[PDB]
Design a protein around this ligand. Structure first.
Ligand SMILES: [Mg+2]
Ligand SMILES: [Mg+2]
Ligand SMILES: [Mg+2]
Ligand SMILES: [Mg+2]
Ligand SMILES: [Mg+2]
Ligand SMILES: [Mg+2]
Ligand SMILES: [Mg+2]
Ligand SMILES: [Mg+2]
Ligand SMILES: [Mg+2]
Ligand SMILES: [Mg+2]
Lengths: 676, 681
């Protein structure tokens, strides 16, 4: 069913129009909702503009680097994600006023389903775009250039990661640089300062756009890495045709996931995502045995491996939901610490962030470990079996992210409720209706953390699969064998490998701490900019929002190239100056440190944010107790949405440039495996 | 010259009495100095009491586990460090009042040398105790039981690490649980500056100061001096190199004791004198080591200089970390003012950016420890049975480097007692309302000490990073000995980084450290709350205006802190054991990998930021010197990085280091449970 990948995929626009026309179904509410669009307009118009500049130049560079041709698949790969991004962005800006007007007089359900449908637009679209764009080029290359046709479409992944890197560090900086600069100049969502629109425009850039594009990396890298695996091993094409079927059902499981046909409490979100998976699993178990014929133990192995990747997601949902929701303790543990002081709640609110990372880690290892076994016992040398093992882990990581559609649907429901939460406080809407937007926002805050777990954890499984894929790229370049030398050259105790593991964990500090000082300083350029305008005339009686948008992006994107390119070079220099061993260690320590830390922060930031919401509804005042809880908010605030989610686009892309330069780096090493 | 290692060592305690009697050379000033002693008394009396309980029980267990005998060296090994601790404890309690009275009327020099002399007591003694304690049992075991006599004396390291674990997690908790409980009750209920006499937390804090950096840190570094000499000597023995190397290293260490005996001698102006002496206390050691090294031992000119070059790389890195942390930690330098100025905005903004300058302060240390062992790896590889026989000459070149780095520990611990002793004086002056100017100079000695304690965390942790790979190779030969009753062919191809259990372990190793630190953070944060409540019950009874009570606050904090200690302490012992047996030795090899990969960068990330927030407070606390919205922000950052500075940062290092020390003890016990050479179940 290779051709079928396009059939159901193109229905994304078919179904995105349904939800788009669903959202398209006040004076002050319209201007602010329209302001989010104009702000997001100048953002994307300027973000895609410079984005295409570097894409075409590098697409021209990749065209000569491949010389068949691959820059063509390189280009559309990036265009696919951005297309689903522009589709979901125009929805979020309009939802801010839609869900606000719907919730106030309709009830809690009206808000939950409206803000949820606005998110189903992006989730189902992007997932649809990913499947059809690879299945389209997969079938084209399948018949076009035999003998490793899957590799050409794999460059579609690299070009698509370059753009997710763009908005994660760019949108991540902008999302928090505005949230930070707007919050403290007020000391929230007060109309006096223009930072309220720059923040909410950031909300759609941090979690709606920046995060949704990030997970696009998960859906594209594993399908290209998993297909690339089954090819390089020499296994039958039965494996490659089954994975495309599992993916299509995930689109079917996410097409059904978003129906949500009586809403009561915000638990409805977790239940649907929970059963949107089982509906996929058993439908996958059953459709898997239908299209392909394999020995019963081997065919279920595919259904069992992907079932392990799909199940882990609801588990991370229930975990982060526990450590993040104010309904549950670990949030009240720190919110109560507000009575003492901010420093004391900081350290202990930091603490419960650490212990919130180990449960996710405990699952991702046990989950891929079981998939490794089942895939190893079911499906030329001792490695040929071991490779069947790491492939069992590839199937797991693939199964995890193929259901990405349902999770991104939630990363747009959270911020859209954040937008609604802003619309009500600045427009001074009724107390009750402006409070429910906050709980929808606090539930959304539990969602963004859940997706960061879903995003980062899925990356951890791919790294070891990308490791093996990187090897076959250094084996191919070595011949122009290596298996006998690299195996005994990359044992963890080798000189380059251990140093790299320290430079990989040291590089991530230099990358994240460079981002933190940048976002913190560019925000100061927003804080300074506000004074420039507010000093001229009084903010009582009101371009101005477009100014804060354009100034913050070009200053944020300006810094982006510094760490973004610095994170590109330092691995390259170590990869060539020391060797591929050094980068293998650099990518090891990075994946080993990045996955736990980003969880430590992704969860803690959400906890401090939800901790404020819990006391901001009870306290709901400027009390020395609440003032302390706000300090914890803005600390974990940018570290939550800027550096936390950036380790994932670093780790995954960190193996994505090394594999493209294995031919370029191995020839520079002038040796098979070196420690000098 | 193996016997000489003991001769000069015992002269350290002989010489330590000179400075101890030198420091021993007012009414309100006398009671507080004696109160620190009674507090340190009830602390050590209760710490050594339970410390001997588990030591004897396990010493009896180790006696049957070895069945020659090795529990004897197990006992004295731990006793050596504690002896240098009790010598420095009685010194620090007396220095609080001594240095205060000396600085006020003599000048800045009088204070700088007195608080420094009080530290030379601990530094020179402990380093002396370490050298004589190993050369003593080394020479005894060299002639007692040939054929792997070095292994029995290696058990001296584990037993000594078990207790350094005691005070790092225990003293670390106590130091910040008291520092925390005393600080916040002054701002929330009392409304007074820290180190104020009204609340009993002022004595509990300063008593903690001597336990966090003076005792907890100095005892921790004893782990560095003991583990590498046993691991490096164990390497040269197991590697098959000539005994010429084993006799030379004992001389280099003695030279370091001579280079540190001269280091403490110390015209005075700015606290830069500390960095200059510690910088030149190394070169004086290096060239003196270069010179005495060629005299006693004969080796090929290129091969003999290799020893002087390898250890010279371990010795030079320390002053480099000193100048690095001194830059990121001292208010004299930028990165501190970067955040102190952010106090004008808000605490959250200075928190995030004060956190930032902590991260980039970790990459310079990492950049050096890798370059240093890499060059030693090369020089040791090209100078000194299979492809491994040459490669092992490399990691041993790294062992010599790690050995060379920590043999100069004496000069650094001398500084870990100068920092808090100035903190003690800093407290003595503000509560006794001593002259403004002289109580301000104690603060600069306190802020300079803050520049010292962070430097030692770098010095402590970095030396551990080089030893880890040495401990990896040493643990391998312990599983090779148990496997035969070959492994080279199986483990090499069984522990390549992509193995199933190894990668899982690397995630469980970095995950376990979170479970250990966040369990420690919640404990110290909650047990401190047991101190805050304790103050109220006593302060509620009678007014704190007009003053047993100090002995209670000491006794209550220890039994509650030590009570929690067993939870992470034993949990950190088990979880590696479970992974080592449930999954295999591959899993623990990965668990110890991810731990060293996260611990070395993490502990630096925190040790430096915590020190920066404290020094950031100091710069604005003298200019502002008031309760200003600007100063309040710098205090919030202080107490955040405050416990993360002295509890989690310095406890990760004794976790990783002890993790390779317990796993090597179970190589015989864990490999038989795995029921396979290398498996990924
Ligand atoms: Mg906010
Ligand atoms: Mg927001
Ligand atoms: Mg908001
Ligand atoms: Mg929020
Ligand atoms: Mg926020
Ligand atoms: Mg303090
Ligand atoms: Mg202190
Ligand atoms: Mg103090
Ligand atoms: Mg201090
Ligand atoms: Mg302190």
């Amino acid at each position: 069913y290779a051709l079928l990948g396009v059939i159901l995929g193109i229905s994304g626009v078919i179904y995105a129009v349904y939800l788009a026309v669903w959202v398209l179904r006040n004076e002050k509410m319209r201007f602010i909702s329209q302001a989010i669009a104009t702000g997001a307009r100048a953002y994307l118009f300027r973000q895609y503009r410079t984005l295409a500049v570097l894409l075409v130049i590098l697409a021209v560079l990749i065209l000569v680097a491949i010389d068949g041709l691959t820059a063509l698949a390189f280009i559309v790969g990036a265009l696919g994600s951005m297309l689903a991004g522009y589709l979901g962005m125009y929805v979020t800006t309009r939802s801010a006023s839609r869900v606000a007007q719907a919730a106030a007089t309709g009830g809690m359900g009206k808000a939950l389903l409206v803000s949820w449908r606005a998110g189903a637009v992006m989730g189902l679209s992007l997932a649809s775009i990913a499947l059809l764009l690879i299945s389209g080029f997969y079938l084209v290359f399948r018949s076009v250039l035999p003998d490793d046709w899957a590799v050409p479409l794999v460059a579609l992944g690299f070009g698509a990661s370059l753009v997710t890197l763009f908005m994660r560090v760019g949108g991540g900086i902008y999302t928090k640089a505005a949230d930070l600069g707007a919050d403290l100049v007020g000391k929230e969502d007060d109309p006096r300062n223009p930072g309220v629109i720059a923040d909410n425009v950031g909300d759609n850039v941090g979690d709606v756009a920046g995060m949704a594009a990030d997970v696009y990396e998960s859906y594209i890298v594993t399908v290209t890495a998993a297909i690339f695996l089954a090819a390089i091993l020499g296994l039958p094409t039965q494996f490659i045709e089954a994975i495309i079927l599992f993916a299509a059902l995930a689109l079917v499981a996410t097409f059904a996931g978003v129906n949500l046909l009586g809403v009561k409490h915000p638990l409805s979100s977790i239940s649907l995502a929970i059963y949107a998976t089982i509906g996929l699993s058993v439908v996958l178990f059953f459709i898997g045995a239908f299209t392909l014929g394999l020995d019963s133990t081997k065919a279920l192995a595919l259904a069992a491996t992907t079932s392990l990747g799909a199940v882990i997601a609801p588990l991370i949902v229930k975990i982060t939901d526990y450590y993040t929701s104010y309904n549950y303790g670990p949030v009240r543990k720190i919110a109560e610490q507000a009575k003492i002081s901010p420093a004391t709640v900081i350290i202990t609110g930091y603490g419960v962030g650490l212990m919130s990372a180990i449960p996710v880690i405990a699952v991702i290892v046990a989950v891929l470990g079981i998939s490794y076994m089942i895939g190893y016992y079911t499906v030329f040398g001792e490695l040929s079996k071991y490779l069947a093992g790491i492939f069992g882990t590839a199937m797991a990581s693939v199964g995890l992210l193929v259901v990405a559609g349902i999770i991104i649907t939630a990363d747009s429901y959270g911020p859209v409720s954040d937008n609604a939460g802003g619309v009500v406080e600045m427009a001074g809407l009724p107390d009750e209706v402006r409070e429910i937007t906050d709980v929808l926002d606090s539930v959304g805050n539990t969602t963004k953390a859940t997706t960061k777990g879903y995003a980062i954890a899925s990356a951890a499984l791919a790294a070891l699969v990308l490791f093996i894929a990187l090897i076959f790229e250094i084996v191919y370049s070595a011949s122009k064998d290596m298996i006998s030398e690299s195996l005994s050259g990359l044992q963890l105790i080798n000189a380059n490998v251990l140093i790299g593991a320290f430079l990989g964990v040291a590089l991530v500090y230099f990358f994240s701490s460079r981002t933190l000082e940048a976002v913190g300083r560019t925000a100061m350029e927003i804080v300074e900019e506000i004074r420039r305008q507010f000093r001229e005339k009084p903010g009582i009686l009101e371009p101005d929002y477009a100014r804060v948008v354009d100034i913050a992006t070009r200053r944020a994107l300006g810094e982006f190239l510094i760490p973004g390119l610095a994170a590109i070079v330092l691995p390259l220099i170590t990869g060539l100056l020391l060797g591929w061993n050094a980068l293998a260690g650099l990518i090891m320590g990075a994946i080993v440190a990045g996955v736990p830390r980003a969880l430590l922060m992704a969860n803690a930031g959400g906890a401090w944010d939800n901790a404020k919401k819990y006391i901001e509804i009870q306290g709901l005042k400027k009390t020395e107790m609440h003032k302390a809880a706000v300090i914890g908010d803005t600390v974990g605030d940018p570290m939550k949405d800027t550096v936390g989610p950036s380790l994932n686009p670093l780790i995954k892309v960190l193996n994505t440039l090394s594999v493209v330069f294995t031919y370029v780096i191995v020839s520079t090493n002038i040796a098979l495996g070196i420690w000098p």
